[PDB]
Amino acid sequence: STKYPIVLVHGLAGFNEIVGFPYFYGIADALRQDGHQVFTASLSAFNSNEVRGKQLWQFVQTLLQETQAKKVNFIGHSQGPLACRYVAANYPDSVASVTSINGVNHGSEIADLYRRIMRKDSIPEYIVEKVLNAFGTIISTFSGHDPQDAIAALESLTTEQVTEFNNKYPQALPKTPGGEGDEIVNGVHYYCFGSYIQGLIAGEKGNLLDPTHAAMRVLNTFFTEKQNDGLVGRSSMRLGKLIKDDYAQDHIDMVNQVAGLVGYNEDIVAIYTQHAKYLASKQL
Ligand SMILES: [Ca+2]
Ligand SMILES: [Ca+2]
């Protein structure tokens, strides 16, 4: 139904193999039921945004050859949107749209803290343990069974590193903190979705059986930005035209994880399928 194929983009190349199901849980399946052509680009987590960007460009080149489409519609999460922005900035004629879903568009405060912990920069022990136990719980839930090894993925998501990325690829970033960027830059459409953790944990419905959610709530308390999804602050997610960012969902919830266990009986998959129809309505 969309003119151009949809490319789902995320970091963690080994996710599907190690976890046993897709990063975007049930989302590609749902989009294909609505007649969209869908592909997933799983990029290398333990490296720079620019390296993921180059990875994604190679993926897109091969895909465009195989489809004879002239452009792609990117839908990225977390690391994904930065790689998408790299490709859009550098190869705008090959990108119809960039949609950012809880993208780390201006850095992650927990990544910042993680680096301070790793550098032993005067972080009190009780905070060190809370942060490391949270990440361990998240990793173990997905993998099945160390938490300091996660810095490999967060290294490229610090405020300092993303600020440097934004300096090189400023397209569609908001001019004011917590605002919106230009919808169309260099012929490419930019959209953003977001969320932040809300309410007391008792009312989270499906998430009560998801061990990652309590961990995200722990990480959430260490942000100076009070509205955050446990990994990124609400304002940091902003890119291009806002669609909606007040979902009561953590970072992991917004890709329908773990295995469909989300907050408040929200239909996360519907966020994606409705947006795909929205892209189609914009002649994309
Ligand atoms: Ca970078
Ligand atoms: Ca969840």
Residue numbers in the entry: 2 to 146, 149 to 287
From the paper:
The placement of the lid helices α5 and α8 suggest that PML is in a “closed” conformation with the position of α5 preventing access of long-chain triacylglycerols to the active site. The position of α5 is similar to that seen in the closed conformation of BGL and in stark contrast to the position of the lid seen in the open conformation of PAL that has an inhibitor bound. Surprisingly, in both the DEP inhibited and apo structures of PML, the positively charged loop between α5 and α6 adopts a conformation that opens an ∼9Å diameter hole in PML. The hole allows 2 PEG molecules from the crystallization solvent to be accommodated in a wide pocket that extends to S79 and exposes the active site of PML to solvent, even in the “closed” conformation. S79 appears to be in a “catalytically competent” conformation in PML even in the absence of inhibitor with the Oγ of S79 pointed away from the Nε2 of H254. The observed differences in the PML oxyanion hole suggests that the oxyanion hole is unique in PML and much more open than in other I.1 and I.2 lipases of known structure. It is also possible that the oxyanion hole is not pre-formed in the closed structure of PML. We also see remarkable differences in the active site pocket as it is much more exposed and solvent accessible than the active site seen in other lipases of known structure, even though our PML structure otherwise appears to be in a closed conformation. The Ca2+ ion in PML is found octahedrally coordinated to five main-chain or side-chain atoms and a single water. In PML, the Ca2+ is coordinated by atoms from the side chains of N210, D213, D256, the main-chain carbonyl oxygens from Q260 and L264, and a water molecule.
The lipase from Proteus mirabilis is a family I.1 lipase (100% identical to Proteus sp. k107 lipase) that has potential for practical applications (hereafter referred to as PML). Here we present crystal structures of PML in the absence and presence of diethyl phosphonate, a potent lipase inhibitor. Like the other family I.1 and I.2 lipases, PML adopts an α/β hydrolase fold with a central β-sheet core of 5 parallel β-strands and the first two βstrands are missing compared to the canonical α/β hydrolase fold. PML contains a typical hydrolase Ser-His-Asp catalytic triad with the catalytic serine, S79, part of a G-X-S-X-G motif between α3 and β5.
